[PDB]
Amino acid sequence: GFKPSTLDKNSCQDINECEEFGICPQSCRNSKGSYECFCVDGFKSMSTHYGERCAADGSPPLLLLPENVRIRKYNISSEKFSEYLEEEEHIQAIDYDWDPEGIGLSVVYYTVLSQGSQFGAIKRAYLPDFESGSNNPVREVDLGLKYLMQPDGLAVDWVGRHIYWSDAKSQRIEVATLDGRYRKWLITTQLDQPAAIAVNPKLGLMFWTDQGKQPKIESAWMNGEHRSVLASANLGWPNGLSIDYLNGDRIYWSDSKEDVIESIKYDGTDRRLIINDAMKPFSLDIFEDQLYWVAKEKGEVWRQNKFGKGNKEKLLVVNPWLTQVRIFHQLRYNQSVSNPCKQVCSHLCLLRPGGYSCACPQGSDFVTGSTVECDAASELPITMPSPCRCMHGGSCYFDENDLPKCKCSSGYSGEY
Amino acid sequence: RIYWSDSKEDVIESIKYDGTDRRLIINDAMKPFSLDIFEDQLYWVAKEKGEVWRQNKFGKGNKEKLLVVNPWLTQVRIFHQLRY
Amino acid sequence: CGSGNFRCDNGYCIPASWRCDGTRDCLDDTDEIGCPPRSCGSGFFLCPAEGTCIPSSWVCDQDKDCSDGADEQQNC
Amino acid sequence: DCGDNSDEESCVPRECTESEFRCADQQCIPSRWVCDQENDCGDNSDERDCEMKTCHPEHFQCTSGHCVPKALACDGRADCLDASDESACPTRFPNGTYCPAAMFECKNHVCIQSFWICDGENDCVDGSDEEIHLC
């Protein structure tokens, strides 16, 4: 547990074992001559053949899978499928918000590609936290964001209440209110086929990938003010990006031209290969000790240990229209994080390292001499209709007032 | 009577078992790849986008989309006692 | 600007409560460019790079307990 | 141009010139076509992002972000698909009407052939064509 000192080779110093990669699942604590390891709040530790696990409280995780015409849910605990959204076309990307309104329904955001002369869309739907299927039909809302062509990158910010998206054919990265009211262009120059986007509100940073002639992976401030390139060498077609918030705010990406999954730190200072022969990976997500990725050529979901250890397993076979895999759970995104904004901004408040800044929608500008107010009209929030909430297998019908109302199974009773 | 589907010409055609009467039942059939017939109805599969379509086997009227099933779909068969 | 508020180099003033509260309000960051430390017991030493406190003897005992500095050769 | 396609099979899209606009199919079209309400490029990419762009000095801009020749502003005919070219301009006659009595007038301030009142499509972009009180 001790190594010779460089200052005096006759003396002994303590190795920081926590600086080794994959030493422990969630958190490590250095001791003079030893180390200790622990799981953070919301997690528990359990024995297993490979050592201590970290396992999460709450209802077990689910996987969200967008096909071209449907979004479908898979339950790792029950190893079963459930039906969420259907009769769409050209779905590409998904992201979720866990409890935007306190009721037991999450909210889901998904992007739709342009079919032809018709433009694409960003759409908004309610996802029950509880067990449900086609008994609770889902309505859709459209954010009204015009002129979308190939919005193949979507991210959601739950602290600032914003949605971020990348479009390969507009060659822009844009942020809007989480209901589509105010729209801003953050990164407009030196982009070629932007493909994937991720956000970290705690650090106030956004990360994205480019898939064009010069493949690069970049990081910026969530307000766009600072920009940097974390990796440029050996990047092929970097098509998917994910973040681990418990293993020290670390970034993972997938490349289909090199059939590889790689990880870096948010400053670019340590680069590693986690999974080779990854079979043309196209999307990534990380939960607990495990890393899940999608294989594009043959429609498969694979999982491995996020530190590269051991062996890889095939979890599902879902047809080639599968574009993404997302992990759905309370503890994936830290809901507790608090918004720095203090209600000074008139239209947009956007996060940056250690605080916030005020922003005006596109085409508008600050009123002369101000840094918090804009020459633009106020837009009222767009609240969406109440969803079908019948919990225990009940079935919902829309009454003459178009309100959803439930009918129970013989074993249950109640309004919902 | 015999029916066949052609994906290079996007057509469904019918002939008699001796070849003596040839007809086009469905044009713009969307690259049809498999066929089956039951009662007044003709069912066929579209290969590029994974769809099952049905029309009247004599070509009459209009065509309907019955299912959307992913591109791995290779065939449609009709399962009933009185088919054979 | 005045009446007991606090001022930013941008030509902008904010309530005094905002001045040192862990959130950069001025775009020039001068509200929190300097704020005093909040300390541990007299028997201990504090490091801000990790928000941590260690016994004072640790400050020079041939172990890098504080990663960015304030330990070993700098203090020794 | 020659029936073996040898003139085209090996070709790479050419770079667009100073007054051209480029489309994601790597095609070049005149800049004037951009945001002209017609999908000149098949993906409708020439009509993209129009609301944030400014307009050519010869052309009026519609609320929908689309450009129309300025001589067709306030002419009585809906040249903008949103009728914003006609919705806004000054009074035309001492009558206070925007349209002669030989014709029909709709709240879009658009002036329309009288016979068009109550036949099929609403010839006035939204201004109460086909209403039963006309029919």
Ligand SMILES: *[C@@H]1O[C@H](CO)[C@@H](O)[C@H](O)[C@H]1NC(C)=O
């Ligand atoms: C997932 O399956 C478990 C049983 O394995 C069940 O308890 C849980 O409610 C399921 N989750 C959902 C969202 O249906």
Ligand SMILES: *[C@@H]1O[C@H](CO)[C@@H](O)[C@H](O)[C@H]1NC(C)=O
């Ligand atoms: C979530 O964020 C809160 C507030 O910053 C923090 O106290 C807590 O430790 C975080 N939890 C996890 C699991 O990261």
Ligand SMILES: *[C@@H]1O[C@H](CO)[C@@H](O)[C@H](O)[C@H]1NC(C)=O
């Ligand atoms: C007023 O309106 C009537 C009918 O449109 C027309 O005969 C007349 O010429 C108009 N007069 C003036 C002064 O505009």
Ligand SMILES: *[C@@H]1O[C@H](CO)[C@H](O)[C@H](O)[C@H]1NC(C)=O
């Ligand atoms: C907008 O169009 C005008 C002409 O009306 C000018 O060409 C102007 O330069 C254009 N906008 C920009 C940013 O150049």
Ligand SMILES: *[C@@H]1O[C@H](CO)[C@H](O)[C@H](O)[C@H]1NC(C)=O
């Ligand atoms: C516009 O029309 C009104 C009503 O007919 C008056 O005639 C007015 O004089 C007109 N405007 C101008 C500037 O002449």
Ligand SMILES: [Ca+2]
């Ligand atoms: Ca140690």
Ligand SMILES: [Ca+2]
């Ligand atoms: Ca402050």
Ligand SMILES: [Ca+2]
């Ligand atoms: Ca030490």
Ligand SMILES: [Ca+2]
């Ligand atoms: Ca055009």
Ligand SMILES: [Ca+2]
């Ligand atoms: Ca034209």
Ligand SMILES: [Ca+2]
């Ligand atoms: Ca006109």
Ligand SMILES: [Ca+2]
């Ligand atoms: Ca007509």
Ligand SMILES: [Ca+2]
């Ligand atoms: Ca009419």
